[PDB]
Design an enzyme around this catalytic site. Structure first.
Site, PDB file in Angstrom:
ATOM      1  N   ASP A   1       4.739  -4.979   5.606  1.00 10.87           N
ATOM      2  CA  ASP A   1       3.725  -5.631   4.695  1.00 10.87           C
ATOM      3  C   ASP A   1       3.841  -5.153   3.356  1.00 10.87           C
ATOM      4  OD1 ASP A   1       0.170  -5.391   3.773  1.00 10.87           O
ATOM      5  OD2 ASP A   1       1.245  -7.094   4.510  1.00 10.87           O
ATOM      6  N   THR A   2       5.016  -5.071   2.844  1.00 12.77           N
ATOM      7  CA  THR A   2       5.198  -5.021   1.196  1.00 12.77           C
ATOM      8  C   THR A   2       6.123  -5.991   0.783  1.00 12.77           C
ATOM      9  OG1 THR A   2       7.352  -3.384   1.841  1.00 12.77           O
ATOM     10  CG2 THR A   2       4.877  -2.383   1.163  1.00 12.77           C
TER      11      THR A   2
ATOM     12  N   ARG B   1      -5.479  -5.124   4.193  1.00 12.63           N
ATOM     13  CA  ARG B   1      -6.159  -6.153   3.779  1.00 12.63           C
ATOM     14  C   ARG B   1      -7.429  -6.364   4.861  1.00 12.63           C
ATOM     15  NH1 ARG B   1      -1.350  -7.108   2.482  1.00 12.63           N
ATOM     16  NH2 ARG B   1      -1.206  -8.464   4.471  1.00 12.63           N
TER      17      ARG B   1
ATOM     18  N   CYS C   1       8.383   5.907  -3.669  1.00  9.47           N
ATOM     19  CA  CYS C   1       8.731   5.032  -2.515  1.00  9.47           C
ATOM     20  C   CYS C   1      10.328   5.318  -2.150  1.00  9.47           C
ATOM     21  CB  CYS C   1       8.700   3.397  -3.018  1.00  9.47           C
ATOM     22  SG  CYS C   1       9.269   2.320  -1.524  1.00  9.47           S
ATOM     23  N   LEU C   2      10.557   5.669  -0.856  1.00  6.02           N
ATOM     24  CA  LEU C   2      12.012   5.738  -0.409  1.00  6.02           C
ATOM     25  C   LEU C   2      12.660   4.480  -0.100  1.00  6.02           C
ATOM     26  CD1 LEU C   2      11.056   8.891   1.916  1.00  6.02           C
ATOM     27  CD2 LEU C   2      12.773   8.754   0.221  1.00  6.02           C
ATOM     28  N   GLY C   3      11.731   3.582   0.350  1.00  2.00           N
ATOM     29  CA  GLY C   3      12.560   2.230   0.859  1.00  2.00           C
ATOM     30  C   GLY C   3      12.762   1.182  -0.309  1.00  2.00           C
TER      31      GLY C   3
HETATM   32  C1  HEM Z   1       8.064  -4.202  -2.871  1.00  5.91           C
HETATM   33  C2  HEM Z   1       7.871  -3.159  -1.890  1.00  5.91           C
HETATM   34  C3  HEM Z   1       7.603  -1.893  -1.778  1.00  5.91           C
HETATM   35  C4  HEM Z   1       6.592  -1.596  -2.542  1.00  5.91           C
HETATM   36  C5  HEM Z   1       5.819  -2.149  -3.900  1.00  5.91           C
HETATM   37  C6  HEM Z   1       6.140  -0.218  -2.032  1.00  5.91           C
HETATM   38  C7  HEM Z   1       5.292   1.025  -2.822  1.00  5.91           C
HETATM   39  C8  HEM Z   1       5.187   2.053  -2.428  1.00  5.91           C
HETATM   40  C9  HEM Z   1       4.375   3.011  -3.280  1.00  5.91           C
HETATM   41  C10 HEM Z   1       3.587   2.573  -4.386  1.00  5.91           C
HETATM   42  C11 HEM Z   1       4.354   4.242  -2.468  1.00  5.91           C
HETATM   43  C12 HEM Z   1       3.720   5.702  -2.911  1.00  5.91           C
HETATM   44  C13 HEM Z   1       2.413   5.579  -2.032  1.00  5.91           C
HETATM   45  C14 HEM Z   1       1.555   6.826  -2.373  1.00  5.91           C
HETATM   46  O1  HEM Z   1       2.092   7.759  -3.460  1.00  5.91           O
HETATM   47  O2  HEM Z   1       0.362   7.064  -1.726  1.00  5.91           O
HETATM   48  C15 HEM Z   1       5.325   4.087  -1.500  1.00  5.91           C
HETATM   49  C16 HEM Z   1       5.620   4.937  -0.466  1.00  5.91           C
HETATM   50  C17 HEM Z   1       6.717   4.964   0.645  1.00  5.91           C
HETATM   51  N1  HEM Z   1       7.456   3.707   1.098  1.00  5.91           N
HETATM   52 FE1  HEM Z   1       7.241   2.144  -0.299  1.00  5.91          FE
HETATM   53  N2  HEM Z   1       6.925   0.200  -1.119  1.00  5.91           N
HETATM   54  C18 HEM Z   1       7.726  -1.057  -0.943  1.00  5.91           C
HETATM   55  C19 HEM Z   1       8.484  -1.036   0.187  1.00  5.91           C
HETATM   56  C20 HEM Z   1       8.840  -0.295   1.213  1.00  5.91           C
HETATM   57  C21 HEM Z   1       9.902  -0.218   2.395  1.00  5.91           C
HETATM   58  C22 HEM Z   1      10.613  -1.391   2.718  1.00  5.91           C
HETATM   59  C23 HEM Z   1       9.697   0.925   3.236  1.00  5.91           C
HETATM   60  C24 HEM Z   1      10.463   1.014   4.330  1.00  5.91           C
HETATM   61  C25 HEM Z   1       9.675   0.980   5.480  1.00  5.91           C
HETATM   62  C26 HEM Z   1       8.587   1.639   2.596  1.00  5.91           C
HETATM   63  C27 HEM Z   1       8.602   3.090   2.878  1.00  5.91           C
HETATM   64  C28 HEM Z   1       7.900   4.082   1.998  1.00  5.91           C
HETATM   65  C29 HEM Z   1       7.841   5.335   2.403  1.00  5.91           C
HETATM   66  C30 HEM Z   1       8.822   6.049   3.456  1.00  5.91           C
HETATM   67  C31 HEM Z   1       7.042   5.896   1.435  1.00  5.91           C
HETATM   68  C32 HEM Z   1       6.681   7.483   1.464  1.00  5.91           C
HETATM   69  C33 HEM Z   1       7.155   8.401   0.865  1.00  5.91           C
HETATM   70  C34 HEM Z   1       6.458   9.941   0.718  1.00  5.91           C
HETATM   71  O3  HEM Z   1       5.447   9.796   1.067  1.00  5.91           O
HETATM   72  O4  HEM Z   1       7.358  10.817   0.207  1.00  5.91           O
HETATM   73  N3  HEM Z   1       8.337   1.161   1.236  1.00  5.91           N
HETATM   74  N4  HEM Z   1       5.827   2.566  -1.425  1.00  5.91           N
HETATM   75  C1  LIG Z   2       0.618   2.103  -0.084  1.00  4.78           C
HETATM   76  C2  LIG Z   2       1.804   1.855   0.778  1.00  4.78           C
HETATM   77  C3  LIG Z   2       2.531   0.519   0.080  1.00  4.78           C
HETATM   78  C4  LIG Z   2       2.804   3.073   1.034  1.00  4.78           C
HETATM   79  C5  LIG Z   2       4.036   2.354   2.003  1.00  4.78           C
HETATM   80  C6  LIG Z   2       2.953   1.688   3.045  1.00  4.78           C
HETATM   81  C7  LIG Z   2       1.579   1.824   2.292  1.00  4.78           C
HETATM   82  C8  LIG Z   2       0.551   0.974   2.719  1.00  4.78           C
HETATM   83  C9  LIG Z   2       0.958   3.621   2.552  1.00  4.78           C
HETATM   84  O1  LIG Z   2       0.250   3.646   3.384  1.00  4.78           O
HETATM   85  C10 LIG Z   2       1.900   4.296   1.772  1.00  4.78           C
END
Ligand code: HEM
Ligand SMILES: CC1(C)[C@@H]2CC[C@@]1(C)C(=O)C2
Length: 405
Positions: free
Chosen positions: A242-243, A177, A348-350
């Site tokens: 930040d999620t 942001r 998303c892995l998290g």
């Molecule tokens: C409500 C919370 C969350 C939302 C809505 C969210 C949403 C997303 C989305 C939409 C993506 C795909 C991005 C893309 O395709 O360009 C993503 C990827 C990812 N998120 Fe989450 N996320 C959340 C929480 C987290 C948390 C807690 C972590 C842990 C630090 C995290 C780690 C990741 C990772 C490792 C990826 C990359 C996976 C890959 O590229 O193969 N996320 N997330």
């Molecule tokens: C779009 C996302 C929510 C996803 C995990 C953190 C984020 C800001 C990225 O750059 C990939």
């Protein structure tokens, strides 16, 4: 500031939407973005804001684009282009098959088994935070719970000092942001300046923390490089800080305004999981994109190589063609369809960690503070970006109605 329309873009496909400052923001960020799904708006449009780019407005197109990495590459996922170009986090800025190897490693540190092992800690912290607030009869949810709860859990998993949160959080927010204070490249440099020394130490003297696990991990048979570890940890940081933080505020803001939904969860606890999915659909908050690798005709529209396209993960579940009465929150929906955690190879892995933190918050909060509302006169303000959020959330309640547990 609208950029001049490119030669290949038909004027009837123009709709100047600013993802960083949408028009109807006062009505709520999700509502502000949903204007793209009005009947007068085509399924695929071009906005001249933020340098000019396409925007898919329907769940079907968003899913298709995310599945076809051959035409839509993750190489440049952020808008504006400057941000997308400076963007180099692993594994999100990579396309398959390269992506797969790093994804497997990242799954090792935030995957399901890790969540299972941290469960008791998540629960202890949630209960501890809520009980300390309960007797006060008021709080600013964003800074009193939404931020500390998930962030402290991540700092614990990463093995980083709590004193660094203010610093790290600020840099993270500038990336999703943009304040205008600094450019994406500069924010990323600073974040890397922080990580480099740490990774160095963790390589020499490893620990059991996620950073030590990533820094000494193996990829493609060989060991990960310092640079690769730095870029992966950079991603974990942004995701952990930040999620979930922003999502909790949207959900709590809604629960504070809907006594009937609070009661439902209090009387029928077996519904919390379902409710969590529905809230994840209604308050989806992420929107990033892809870049065209070559000229391509997508659903009748001619896209040119190098063109950037925003595929709002948040819009899929708000699309009426996917969910009837999308703006209405219904915990008993027969089918909750959304792409809140993404779609395709970058799912998303998290998300397991996120779901655990959300469900624990709902259960433990409504157990001790079943009755609360937004402070009279407070005006809740949302902020738009790659990840949307809530500026502040002043809550109030009668301590006499709370239950110590
Ligand atoms: C409500 C919370 C969350 C939302 C809505 C969210 C949403 C997303 C989305 C939409 C993506 C795909 C991005 C893309 O395709 O360009 C993503 C990827 C990812 N998120 Fe989450 N996320 C959340 C929480 C987290 C948390 C807690 C972590 C842990 C630090 C995290 C780690 C990741 C990772 C490792 C990826 C990359 C996976 C890959 O590229 O193969 N996320 N997330
Ligand atoms: C779009 C996302 C929510 C996803 C995990 C953190 C984020 C800001 C990225 O750059 C990939």
């Amino acid at each position: 500031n609208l950029a001049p329309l490119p030669p290949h873009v038909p004027e009837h496909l123009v709709f100047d939407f600013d993802m960083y400052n949408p028009s109807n923001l006062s009505a709520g960020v999700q509502e502000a973005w949903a204007v793209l799904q009005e009947s007068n708006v085509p399924d695929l449009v071009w906005t001249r804001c933020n340098g000019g780019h396409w925007i898919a407005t329907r769940g079907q197109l968003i899913r298709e684009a995310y599945e076809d990495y051959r035409h839509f590459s993750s190489e440049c996922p952020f808008i504006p282009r400057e941000a997308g170009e400076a963007y180099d986090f692993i594994p999100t800025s990579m396309d398959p098959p390269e992506q797969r190897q790093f994804r497997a490693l990242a799954n090792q540190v935030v995957g399901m088994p890790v969540v299972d092992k941290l469960e008791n800690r998540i629960q202890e912290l949630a209960c501890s935070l809520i009980e300390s607030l309960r007797p006060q009869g008021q709080c600013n949810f964003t800074e009193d719970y939404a931020e500390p709860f998930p962030i402290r859990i991540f700092m614990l998993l990463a093995g980083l000092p709590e004193e660094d949160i203010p610093h790290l959080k600020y840099l993270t927010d500038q990336m999703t942001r943009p304040d205008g204070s600094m450019t994406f490249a500069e924010a990323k440099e600073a974040l890397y300046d922080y990580l480099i020394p740490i990774i160095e130490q963790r390589r020499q003297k490893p620990g059991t923390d996620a950073i030590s696990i990533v820094a000494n991990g193996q990829v493609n048979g060989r060991p990960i490089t310092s640079d690769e570890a730095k870029r992966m940890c950079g991603l974990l940081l942004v995701g952990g800080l930040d999620t979930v933080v922003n999502f909790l505020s949207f959900s709590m803001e809604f629960l504070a305004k809907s006594p009937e939904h609070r009661q439902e969860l209090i009387e029928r606890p077996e519904r919390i999981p379902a409710a969590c999915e529905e809230l994840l659909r209604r308050f989806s908050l992420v929107a990033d994109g892809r870049i065209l690798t070559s000229d391509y005709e997508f659903h009748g529209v001619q896209l040119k190589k190098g063109d950037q396209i925003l595929l709002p993960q948040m819009l899929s579940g708000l699309d009426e063609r996917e969910n009837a009465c999308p703006m209405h929150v219904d915990f008993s929906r027969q089918k909750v369809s959304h792409t809140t955690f993404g779609h395709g190879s970058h799912l998303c892995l998290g998300q397991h960690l996120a779901r655990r933190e959300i469900i624990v918050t709902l259960k433990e909060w409504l157990t001790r503070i079943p009755d609360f509302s937004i402070a009279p006169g407070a005006q809740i303000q949302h902020k738009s970006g790659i990840v949307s959020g809530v500026q502040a959330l002043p809550l109030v309640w009668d301590p006499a109605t709370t239950k110590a547990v």
